[PDB]
Amino acid sequence: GPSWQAYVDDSLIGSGNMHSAAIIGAADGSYWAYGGSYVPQPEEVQHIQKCLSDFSFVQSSGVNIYGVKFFGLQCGTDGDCKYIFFKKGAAGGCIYTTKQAFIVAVYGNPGDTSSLQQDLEKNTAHAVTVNPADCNTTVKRIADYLIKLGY
Amino acid sequence: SSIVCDNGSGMVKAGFSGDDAPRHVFPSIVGRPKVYVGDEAQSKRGVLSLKYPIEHGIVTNWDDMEKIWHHTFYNELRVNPEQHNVLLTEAPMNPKQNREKMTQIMFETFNVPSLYIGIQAVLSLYSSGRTTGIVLDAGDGVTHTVPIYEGYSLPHAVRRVDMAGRDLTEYLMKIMMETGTTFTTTAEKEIVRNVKEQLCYVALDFEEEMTNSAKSANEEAFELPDGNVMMVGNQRFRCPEVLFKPSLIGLDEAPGFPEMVYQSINKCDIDVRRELYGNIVLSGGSTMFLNLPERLAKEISNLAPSSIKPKVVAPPERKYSVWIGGSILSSLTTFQTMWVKKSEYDESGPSIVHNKCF
Ligand SMILES: Nc1ncnc2c1ncn2[C@@H]1O[C@H](COP(=O)(O)OP(=O)(O)OP(=O)(O)O)[C@@H](O)[C@H]1O
Ligand SMILES: [Ca+2]
């Protein structure tokens, strides 16, 4: 069967648009599945839950994952999906809610400066970096699929 | 080969990526026989009704906007769209529908290979060499304060004021009427616009400027095309003062440039606050008045906390900053994978720019 961990392993992290992902129970905060190092701790899960109930918490304090503070960029509702976009240096990610859960994804290195800022300083030919839009789109397509299934 | 087209409420700036300045700058109007676009519609206000496709930075009528784009690709740039990636610009908080319509027009009417829509203030910030800061963009029909972190704007902290250069020119006409001379014809309004763009300046000390202009009878001489001389007095610094005191035109709900920057910053996460104060980037034609950056710096320093020293960035090329950053962004290696290809449009539809362009 298509396990929750397989979604994290193959559908989320396995897409290449994120190095960490976690599917988390919306009310109980339980870890349905998680992968990578940038997975929110229980106290960080409760903060995300409070953020999903009040977007002004994201604007004033962002979200914390793996002990790292990420700045909130933009929140809203994409239909049945509540979304939160965050960023920290070259890293960032998104939170997308489903019917009874939400997905947290993280890409990039937060201790590094963004590749666009490095190119602005010195435009050098380098390897392809993760597009934050691709991370958002992958999680959005997944989240839309669970909502269609009812999860 | 990549195209950069910055569509403003008054002026369109079109050029190629990699260049340091827009190669074609022309008014954003459409003239209809009582169809013509650009400088020629400007010069022919006798058989033509003039329309502005973009109002306050937002596209209002799409037929004339398509005409502007047609005149930009073929009559100005003299190029075929299918052979060139086009980077387009939009105002902050652009309605989702409008982005979908411009995407569909670019990908279907012009069958462009790839397309990207970027926020104008973000492009200005790129032109300033940083990806984090607050941009004050003041043009002809709209003014925005946009906080931005790592190349992404913070929409909850953006402020829009529907007042800019056109309102300033109208106010200059009004306050020049008090000398006994009226400015109602086309040529007279042209003279007023020229006086605003050439003689007006921001007073470093408004009350001291009033005193020095009243006690010394300081008046500047503007030469008219016919050789006659027009004396302009304190109006030179009373017109752009509206940008700092919008209540001069009854715009009490507009806070003015320093308080605009202050309130936008104060709506942000305080962890970024300092970095926003240290990178206040000015862009747009209405930021080009003399002493405007220094006055804004003094006021924002008076408002900021004690442990914060704000810094205003204002290069002599502010008016085209949005374009320059664009031509810079389309030149970076990271951006090459950020283009929205036509295949993605055929797959997901016009809504794809909601995910790829944020
Ligand atoms: N040197 C100058 N000093 C003052 N005002 C100027 C100067 N040069 C241009 N302007 C004014 O700036 C405006 C044009 O600025 P800009 O090209 O940035 O606007 P836009 O892109 O057409 O409009 P918007 O950003 O409002 O959609 C006009 O009102 C023009 O009169
Ligand atoms: Ca503009």
Author numbering:
A (entry chain B): 0 to 150
B (entry chain A): 6 to 39, 52 to 375
From the paper:
We obtained crystals of the Leishmania profilin in complex with an ATP–actin monomer and determined the structure of the complex at 2.2 Å resolution. The structure revealed that Leishmania profilin forms a 1:1 stoichiometric complex with ATP–actin monomer and interacts with the barbed end face of the actin monomer at the border of actin subdomains 1 and 3, similar to other profilins. The overall fold of Leishmania profilin is also similar to the reported structures of profilins from other organisms, such as mammals, yeasts, malaria parasite, and Asgard archaea. Furthermore, the conformation of Leishmania actin in the complex with profilin is very similar to the structure of actin in the previously determined from bovine and Archaea profilin–actin complexes. The most striking difference of Leishmania and Trypanosoma profilins compared with the profilins from other organisms is the presence of a ∼20 amino acid insertion. In our crystal structure, this insertion is located between the last β-strand and C-terminal α-helix of the profilin fold, and it adopts an α-helical conformation flanked by small stretches of flexible linker sequences. Interestingly, the α-helical part of the loop interacts with the target binding cleft of actin, between actin subunits 1 and 3. More detailed analysis of the binding mode of trypanosomatid-specific loop of profilin with actin shows that two leucines, Leu115 and Leu119, of the α-helical region of the insertion associate with the hydrophobic pocket of actin formed by residues Ile345, Leu346, Leu349, and Tyr143 in the target binding cleft located between subdomains 1 and 3. Interestingly, the position of α-helical insertion (α-helix 4) of Leishmania profilin on the actin monomer and the mechanism by which it interacts with the surface of actin are similar to that of the WH2 domain. Thus, the crystal structure of Leishmania profilin–actin complex shows that trypanosomatid profilins interact with actin monomers through a mechanism that is distinct from those of profilins from other organisms.
Along with cofilin, a handful of other canonical ABPs are present in Leishmania and Trypanosoma species. These include the small actin monomer–binding protein profilin, which is found in all eukaryotic organisms that contain a regulated actin cytoskeleton. In animals, yeasts, and plants, profilins inhibit spontaneous nucleation of actin filaments, promote elongation of pre-existing barbed ends of the actin filament, and prevent assembly of actin monomers to the filament pointed ends. Profilins can also accelerate the ADP-to-ATP nucleotide exchange on actin monomers. Besides binding actin, profilins also interact with polyproline-rich motifs, which are typical for actin filament nucleating/polymerizing proteins, such as formins.
